[PDB]
Symmetry: C2
Subunit: 366 residues, 2 copies
Amino acid sequence: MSVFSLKIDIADNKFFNGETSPLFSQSQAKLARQFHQKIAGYRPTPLCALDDLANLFGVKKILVKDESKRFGLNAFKMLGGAYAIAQLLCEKYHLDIETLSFEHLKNAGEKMTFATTTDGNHGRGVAWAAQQLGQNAVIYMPKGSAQERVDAILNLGAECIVTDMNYDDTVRLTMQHAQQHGWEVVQDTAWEGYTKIPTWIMQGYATLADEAVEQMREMGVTPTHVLLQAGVGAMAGGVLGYLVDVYSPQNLHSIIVEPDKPNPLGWEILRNCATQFISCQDSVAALGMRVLGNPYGNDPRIISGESGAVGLGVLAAVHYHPQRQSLMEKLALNKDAVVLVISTEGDTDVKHYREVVWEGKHAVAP
Amino acid sequence: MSVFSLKIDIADNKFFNGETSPLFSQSQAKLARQFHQKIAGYRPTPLCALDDLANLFGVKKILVKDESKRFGLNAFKMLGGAYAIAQLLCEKYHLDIETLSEKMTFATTTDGNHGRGVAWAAQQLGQNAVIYMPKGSAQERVDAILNLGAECIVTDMNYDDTVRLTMQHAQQHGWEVVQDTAWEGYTKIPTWIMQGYATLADEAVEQMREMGVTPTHVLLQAGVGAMAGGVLGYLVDVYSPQNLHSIIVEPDPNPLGWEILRNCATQFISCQDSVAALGMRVLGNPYGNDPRIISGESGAVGLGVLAAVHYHPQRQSLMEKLALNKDAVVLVISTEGDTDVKHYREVVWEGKHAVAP
């Protein structure tokens, strides 16, 4: 079973019209980056070249943006959460984001309470940001949420309520509690009448894309492809929005990867500008985790969680697929392809990570 | 992570008597090392400290001898093969091996590493090698031997029958049989191989003393018994059989090696296939900040046992039985790297021989 077939169903984007989004362009991302540069400990996350994997896979370059090095968060999500939380305080205290002093903000009345529902990473970023800026945070999590993730939030001095409901009901509970107690809801999803905060979050995320382009230009390379994991659409939307502003929608083959098991602002950009959509099996992410965590040849090693590794896992699944030739043609992958991948999270759930990479959970063999 | 139960059948060695070996001690291992040190490109293979894994598993130290770095061969076996072959040439040319620099032909059967070592030695010393491999042998391993200028014949038979054909042809053409196993009337060469292997153990002791540590345990993969007995023979001569908790690991022969094991081993483990698979994955994607080691199926089974014990529901008792605790300094030998690249990546990437289903 070196030759294996995992579900990697490719669909051309029927909604594609190449209309770019001026709200999520270079300029707004560069403003978000200038905020992040002020936080003590800021450093662009590594853009790691998987040369030996690229040679194996039959492409020119594989570049993995390692968002596990994003401060101490082990995930990218603070880029949006902290930026939006900063913009909210600048509104309330009549400050300009361009000239924000954290020290001045600290000695400005009553502490604000930030409320959000999370599966893990987003809420941790809200809790982190509320801990930095001296504010309250109350994070809600649905049932079956990993205790390590509940613990990582509590370690940031914030409350974390595990409910007996799913995500959607827990969002409604967060909204109901926030309306009854006067809290500021900070969700990475948008809906009717809630669009300001999610907009900032998406602009925030584009920081990683702004970094990645600088890093690629430093390398003297031009990306032909990018794989973006879908999640709720915010990261993919924001990052794609930025990348098409830089490269043009026609010169960038963007693949949006949706694992088997949303934000309308992000999805508008994805409908307009995404090249292809892949619907993929659970075991694809798992495969990507292993390839990243035990690299090929002399490639550098990357610790990538379930949500983080799926982009890369698709490339691996294609390479070992019986129909490799036709799949590479469909995705226009070839000896000249320079493929940007984003590893959005590290081993945020250590138990699951080591089950995948050591015990062999979600193995190729079904 | 998850709780699971792989086969790790531990039995105490009831044959234990603590009698050391006159054949496989420090003095022979040091003569073997002095020969190896003379070979162009020699360098003691690394002894890697997996401190963060040791902390996770609840021991003081896990030290892995990484024989994937043994020259360019991705395995340890040349230490025996090359030495024995050098000892054979010094007899034929009446030379002294202690100070050394018609064409013989060496014939052997192999699953991979031993034959490659033999083939390497023949190429280095301007001699001939004819290597026989059984049906189903990995083509990469065949190529590795062919690229050393040797003949590599892949039979349509199993190992035992391929050994017979090696014996038949060797007698026919007057070739010198170089096997890592011993049988009646065939002891001189296997003995040299076992002594040559001890080099790695001599290195490991030098490296541990450089760290200022003393091993409480050693886990040795059983194989044909040549490595285990040769290495254990050296280790018990250094530390005494009493103060060394040796564990011989047999995944699912050699009387010379097995006598030392019967004498000096503390315990034998019979383990499941997936145990070696687990070790390959743990070594190849390390914990915390530990160094990464590339270890093949035969390489990683010692470490795999440690990982299987740690995750077992009966973790506490298994540790008691193996006398593993927060003070345990555990030596593990990674006998080979990724000698079969296809099989390696199937284990580490595809999750072949997964813990569960």
